[PDB]
Amino acid sequence: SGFRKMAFPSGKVEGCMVQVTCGTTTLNGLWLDDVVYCPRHVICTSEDMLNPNYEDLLIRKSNHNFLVQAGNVQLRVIGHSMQNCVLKLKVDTANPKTPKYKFVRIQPGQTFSVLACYNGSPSGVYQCAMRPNFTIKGSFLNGSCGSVGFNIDYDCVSFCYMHHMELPTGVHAGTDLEGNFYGPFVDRQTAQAAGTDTTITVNVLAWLYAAVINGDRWFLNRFTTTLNDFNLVAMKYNYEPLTQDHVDILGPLSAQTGIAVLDMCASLKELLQNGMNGRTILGSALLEDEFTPFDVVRQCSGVT
Amino acid sequence: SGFRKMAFPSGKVEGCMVQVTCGTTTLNGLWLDDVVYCPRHVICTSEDMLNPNYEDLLIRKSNHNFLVQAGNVQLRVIGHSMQNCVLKLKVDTANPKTPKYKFVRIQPGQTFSVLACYNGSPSGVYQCAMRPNFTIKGSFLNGSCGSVGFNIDYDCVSFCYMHHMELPTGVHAGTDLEGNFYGPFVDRQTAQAAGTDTTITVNVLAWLYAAVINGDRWFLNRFTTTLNDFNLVAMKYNYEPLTQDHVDILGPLSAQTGIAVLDMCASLKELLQNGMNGRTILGSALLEDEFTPFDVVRQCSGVT
Numbered sequence: 001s002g003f004r005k006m007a008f009p010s011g012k013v014e015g016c017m018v019q020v021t022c023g024t025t026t027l028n029g030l031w032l033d034d035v036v037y038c039p040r041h042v043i044c045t046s047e048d049m050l051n052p053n054y055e056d057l058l059i060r061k062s063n064h065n066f067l068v069q070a071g072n073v074q075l076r077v078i079g080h081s082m083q084n085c086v087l088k089l090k091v092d093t094a095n096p097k098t099p100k101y102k103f104v105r106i107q108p109g110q111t112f113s114v115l116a117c118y119n120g121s122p123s124g125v126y127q128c129a130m131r132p133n134f135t136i137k138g139s140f141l142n143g144s145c146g147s148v149g150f151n152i153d154y155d156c157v158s159f160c161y162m163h164h165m166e167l168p169t170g171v172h173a174g175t176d177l178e179g180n181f182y183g184p185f186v187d188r189q190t191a192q193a194a195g196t197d198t199t200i201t202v203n204v205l206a207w208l209y210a211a212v213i214n215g216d217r218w219f220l221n222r223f224t225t226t227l228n229d230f231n232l233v234a235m236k237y238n239y240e241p242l243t244q245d246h247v248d249i250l251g252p253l254s255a256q257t258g259i260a261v262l263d264m265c266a267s268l269k270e271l272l273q274n275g276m277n278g279r280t281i282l283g284s285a286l287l288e289d290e291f292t293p294f295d296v297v298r299q300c301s302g303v304t
Numbered sequence: 305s306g307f308r309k310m311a312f313p314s315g316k317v318e319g320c321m322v323q324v325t326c327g328t329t330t331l332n333g334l335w336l337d338d339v340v341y342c343p344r345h346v347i348c349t350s351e352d353m354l355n356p357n358y359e360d361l362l363i364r365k366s367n368h369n370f371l372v373q374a375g376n377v378q379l380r381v382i383g384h385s386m387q388n389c390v391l392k393l394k395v396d397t398a399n400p401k402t403p404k405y406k407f408v409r410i411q412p413g414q415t416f417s418v419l420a421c422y423n424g425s426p427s428g429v430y431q432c433a434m435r436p437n438f439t440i441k442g443s444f445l446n447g448s449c450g451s452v453g454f455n456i457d458y459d460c461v462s463f464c465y466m467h468h469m470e471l472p473t474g475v476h477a478g479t480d481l482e483g484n485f486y487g488p489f490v491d492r493q494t495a496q497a498a499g500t501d502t503t504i505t506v507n508v509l510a511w512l513y514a515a516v517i518n519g520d521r522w523f524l525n526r527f528t529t530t531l532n533d534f535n536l537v538a539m540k541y542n543y544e545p546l547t548q549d550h551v552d553i554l555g556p557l558s559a560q561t562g563i564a565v566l567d568m569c570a571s572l573k574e575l576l577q578n579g580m581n582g583r584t585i586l587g588s589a590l591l592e593d594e595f596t597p598f599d600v601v602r603q604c605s606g607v608t
């Protein structure tokens with residue numbers, strides 16, 4: 001019993017974190033095999049950040065200008081390249097703690113754990129989701145750049161995010177491990193406003209299923225709805241449209257609880273229309289959307 | 305920016321988790337130096353659990369009846385003893401991954417990270433608090449017993465909790481690493497009801513300070529209060545009494561924000577009396593109490 005915002009165990013990723021310094025800028029790097037991945041803005045001064053030409057700035061840098069430190073020992077940089085918004089620093093030593101890994105590009109609504117780091121050292125781990133506007137609501141201070149987001153499937157770490165910046169609004173933007181930003185964000189200190197942060201409907205429904213499995217059932221009503229009727233209500237409340245693919249994904253939770261997906265949609269529609277009335281669901285006074293149907297199944301089943 | 309329910313990096317604790325089996329019961333153990341710590345109820349059958357005499361049940365067990373497996377390799381048990389509600393299994397091999405560690409007994413209101421494990425393997429990490437009724441609101445399934453709670457200070461892991469049971473109400477109880485239960489709970493399947501789960505006032509105030517530091521200031525009012533007036537309101541809302549020790553502990557957050565502790569108490573008093581009115585603070589519709597003043601300082605400063 002109980003349902004918590006749970007992150008993956010971070011050990012495998014802690015063994016990959018290094019400090020990268022270029023000139024006066026220090027941030028974090030991810031060391032996998034003989035390559036250290038880090039945000040390309042490590043080459044920028046605070047002034048360069050206003051309008052950087054990364055190709056031009058990188059010409060003034062050599063291998064010896066990138067200082068890579070792994071747990072108080074210096075790594076030798078024998079090559080460097082820019083791939084989109086990340087730098088790949090080839091080092092002469094393969095990371096002995098390299099886990100099995102993949103680089104994945106996630107879709108909005110997908111969750112992942114972040115290992116927040118400073119100066120190559122881990123400070124904490126938390127769970128978040130790729131928002132529908134392609135921002136993440138993290139907890140990052142200056143120097144956290146290069147901290148990564150990941151999911152674990154048994155022994156394989158799928159790296160999906162690398163932190164690059166905080167928007168003027170306090171929300172966060174970054175890239176996949178190929179250096180491509182999620183959303184329309186650029187690594188420049190310029191006017192970048194995020195779009196509507198809509199609620200991830202399929203995740204709210206998954207969390208309502210977790211609530212039923214954990215005994216919190218007060219919100220279950222005597223109604224049902226259709227996908228089209230539910231979506232008229234969802235659009236009005238800034239919830240993402242629910243598709244038949246989402247209904248299919250909720251199948252296992254629907255089967256476990258015996259609650260048809262469309263019945264849970266009708267319960268959620270009434271919660272949107274009536275509010276919580278001062279009540280809570282799984283200790284929350286708002287509808288939680290940073291648990292995917294997969295996270296709910298995983299947590300409720302005890303996947304290790 | 306941003307404020308997240310952040311757990312400590314779990315790597316150091318992942319390297320200590322083992323599987324302990326006695327007969328048909330399998331749970332988790334913590335391997336530190338040449339000792340494996342686990343709940344003594346590993347010797348119980350589901351029937352024994354109704355009214356166990358642990359001393360008597362332990363007489364029927366020898367070293368070879370405790371099977372300890374660390375990452376698919378078997379450890380040799382060369383001694384066993386019962387200390388309060390934990391068993392200490394002496395093994396012939398010191399854990400090579402033993403971090404610097406301490407065993408601490410925490411007070412209610414204190415937070416810690418839990419590394420939920422099944423069959424000696426980590427499944428997830430989350431942050432929780434020792435409630436004022438000495439329960440924890442975790443996320444534990446059968447087989448999670450022996451999972452531990454901990455805090456990290458740089459390189460020293462202070463182990464403070466070991467999971468032993470779920471109360472009939474779905475909340476959790478366990479011991480410190482000396483085997484002493486937090487609260488009045490016993491490791492027996494009997495009627496054990498928890499006391500009032502009051503709100504940890506000093507932690508709510510700390511989180512309101514985190515909110516101000518992160519730009520969420522709508523709740524700041526033009527009033528102040530006294531400790532005695534605030535506490536009359538706190539008692540009415542099932543909040544723990546605020547003491548001068550708590551005021552002193554909030555000193556650093558009061559200094560950083562320039563908001564006197566008693567002014568923040570008056571803001572909190574108005575939130576209790578008026579409610580949130582459909583508004584949120586740090587993305588929450590309720591007042592969060594599982595962040596200590598130390599956690600707020602740590603997260604807002606980037607301690608690694």
Ligand SMILES: *C(=O)/C(=C/c1ccc(N2CCOCC2)s1)NC(=O)c1cccs1
Binds near residue numbers: 142146167168
């Ligand atoms: C790296 O750690 C880092 C990079 C940034 C690049 C641009 C930034 N912003 C700040 C807001 O105004 C526009 C430019 S930040 N910093 C950070 O990720 C953070 C700094 C403070 C909090 S998080």
Ligand SMILES: *C(=O)/C(=C/c1ccc(N2CCOCC2)s1)NC(=O)c1cccs1
Binds near residue numbers: 446447449469470494
């Ligand atoms: C160990 O993993 C474990 C021990 C328990 C001992 C007594 C328990 N209860 C269950 C509720 O009724 C009274 C007796 S549980 N189990 C657990 O921690 C859990 C089992 C289900 C969820 S957590």
